Design a protein around this ligand. Sequence first.
Ligand SMILES: [Mg+2]
Lengths: 112, 396, 321, 113, 96
Amino acid sequence: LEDAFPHLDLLVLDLGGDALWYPYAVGEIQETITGEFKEALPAEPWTLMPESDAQGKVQAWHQRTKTHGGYQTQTLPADDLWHIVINKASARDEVGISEVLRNKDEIQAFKQ
Amino acid sequence: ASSTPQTNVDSMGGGDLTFEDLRDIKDVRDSGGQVAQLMDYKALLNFGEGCEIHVEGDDETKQLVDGEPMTLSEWLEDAFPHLDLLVLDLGGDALWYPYAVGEIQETITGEFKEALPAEPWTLMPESDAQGKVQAWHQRTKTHGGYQTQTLPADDLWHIVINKASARDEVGISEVLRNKDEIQAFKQNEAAINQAIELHGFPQRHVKVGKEDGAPVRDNDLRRVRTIFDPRTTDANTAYFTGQDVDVETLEAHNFDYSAIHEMDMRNLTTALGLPLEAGNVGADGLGSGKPAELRFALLKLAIKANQRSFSVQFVERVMRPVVRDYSPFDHEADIRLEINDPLEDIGEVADLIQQVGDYMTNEQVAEKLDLPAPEDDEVADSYRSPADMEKDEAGV
Amino acid sequence: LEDAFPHLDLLVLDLGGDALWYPYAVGEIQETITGEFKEALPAEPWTLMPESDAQGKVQAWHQRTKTHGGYQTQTLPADDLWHIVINKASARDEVGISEVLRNKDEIQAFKQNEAAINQAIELHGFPQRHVKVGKEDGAPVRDNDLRRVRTIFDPRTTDANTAYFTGQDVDVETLEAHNFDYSAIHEMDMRNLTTALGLPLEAGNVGADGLGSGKPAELRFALLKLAIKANQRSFSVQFVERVMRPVVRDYSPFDHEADIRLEINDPLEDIGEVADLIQQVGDYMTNEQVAEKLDLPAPEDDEVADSYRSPADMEKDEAGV
Amino acid sequence: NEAAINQAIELHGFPQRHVKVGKEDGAPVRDNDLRRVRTIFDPRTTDANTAYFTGQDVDVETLEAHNFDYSAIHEMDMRNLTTALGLPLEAGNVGADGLGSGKPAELRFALLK
Amino acid sequence: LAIKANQRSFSVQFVERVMRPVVRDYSPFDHEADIRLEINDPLEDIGEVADLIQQVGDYMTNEQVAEKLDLPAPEDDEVADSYRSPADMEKDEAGV
Ligand SMILES: [Mg+2]
């Protein structure tokens, strides 16, 4: 595991930072061409949103990204992404709460 | 005596709280700001330091679970791996809401999966003449409307920290209880913010014309507004005028918003049972000596009471049913869940162990010091240090 | 008894809390269907009141409880309930005093002064803007005229750095925040309430000069500890007599006339001070006395428990032997 | 003295609003006229950040909170009562200068014992 | 306390959703093993830990001392498992 995740300190700070700012940290598992493990690749959390079933489990991920003055869109299955939620509404919440959007009023009050 | 309560229990058939009231608790909890952070701090003090499972006579329980020897404690630790997270989630819910409520979940194979917390604002209990919960009524949002369902109380479990009485199976929300202090705080906060905008900053007043002189009209003031516009003014602008232009200041008008904040925070913290210090507010004479000892003692006593209430109900309503239904072990065993003291100082424990370690078995020392007890039973059971036994054994 | 009453810590806090709020704590003994002891079941003390004979002993219990928008009433014999009284008029009083009904005046005085402070902060804690329009002895200004001025100076649309341009006959005046010492009124109210309820002032998040240190502090905390002991002893005695001994008599093979004691722990005990004591005078204490003071299980071995020198010192001498 | 302090705090511990209507030596204002002014300045319906627009002949005066040392009166009352009942002053939640320390403290606690 | 709660929430989910799938899919090892990710305490004082080790080190195995002190554990198992200091074991082995 230490050989598989050599730079886990940096990854923990990146993902943990994302999960405090955003509702989730989210990313992929990447492979070498030979099919050995390359890395856990963090995705950009502002680009991705989850689609959930009736019991609140994430089934698909919807991505919007800027290119050439427009936006590309794609949908990805939940089967090959992974995600982490620090701030939850309830123990059943897989989508989570942004501390920024939660405290948006205090943030704008401060700035004003 | 008798096998049924012969005293009555003061509620059936109504004239206790609605789904709308349950969603008011949700709104306070998700609205953020200072109220939400204080009640989160309360949840962390009560439940955030984590857990430990004790079984009395645990070694006697040694049994092959699945071709491997386990004790009941070892089985329970495998059954509930993330009990620290569950304790904080359920404990937080039971402080905010009247209850924490949830299911038992099974793998398809029929082995135990988890105790699954439900969303407490979605569920309300239906109770009999003696106040026992017979059914649970759930309301949940989907597709711009509400689904409803009734579940029997036979396959849910629930935990109440805040009781009206020792017979109350429904409980009290601290948020709905202290709703007046919460709104009083929020209203005074809004009042201070609005007052700072109007009164915290000086404002320029330009008066044009001579007193008892020629009248100045609106179009005239438009040209003066252009000359004295704060938008285009810089720090070292100089003004040249005739005698009949007066530049006046609406001053910053003094009010002690700090004192109003301290009062609001004191009212709110005392109402929620936290010390004033949790609100980022200090007080004279209270920070030191026996005054400090008393207030931090009062806090630790409140934490112990909440912890014990939770421990007992969790063991009785979650763990014992799981041991009965999914385990080879005896469900009548002495299971205890202890929740750690958040304000424990290991330096004070270490001082105690130096002073009176000569009276403690090595396992009693290891328990206080939060370590695995010695592997060797005679070493665990003896009074002198394991290192002192080693140097004497090595000498011999 | 420990098996009969597993969660006695919770029961003690529930009943003891009730007996401080209410005149009494009251409840039933309950049986499993098989006839073994189930629990002591606290009743709701606001639902029950005692009926007493000429010598003040409770003969019957009268219960009133809400259901279906009305009240059920029933009478129960005193033979199968039990009750505990902390606050008494006299040592013959079996009915007791509510501290809340006793101190009702201080409670309502506190609440009224609190409400008054809150209302006074709303009116007087913040400056208010007073725009005065017209010349003194000038033309009169009417309500419709003031509506247009109100639009110019509206606090709702004003920002922090708004500038005002006027003729000479508009005056922007201020109702200042009018100073009153709400902090001192709060301290007085909290002092009155805490002293009435017997708590030290520090319990109310209020401090006081000269009281926080030295022999002044020692006295007030000693007074608090004495009050706690008295309440604890009263509860301990009555719980053993009215709950535990009947349970031992009716559901147990043991003798009910034994010396049962319930001790309730001291909330303000410092283990560091106990440890200091054990260093200084441990040479005069049996190992069981040390274990009791230090809140440990006593030694398993009787001669080790009964001896005066440390169990570790006995082990190193047995090891030397 | 306790009842006197309580009554005095209600009357004098809080500021009160005095709206004066009309010009001095001006037109007289009658009770029915003041009822409409009362409706405008009602402390019940007022909020903290209300603003007032008037002509020159409305004066919003304040009865200030009038200073008295109720703390000192309480200390005096408590000193009298505690000394009469033979308790130290500290039993009454009241402190005193110089008495909290040294041989002064030793004497009073010795007298109690 | 707030830091501990966030750390445990992250740790648990990272092991379950990232590490265990990787152990399953790309590794010869058993994915059902007891993996833990601990995230270090930012406000820990090593002086306080060193004070504690002086006072109650006589009750700690050498590996427990090494864990608290953020060192590699002793290479020799009986040295790691024993209670008295590795230096005290050495001076007794040397005396012998
Ligand atoms: Mg003219």
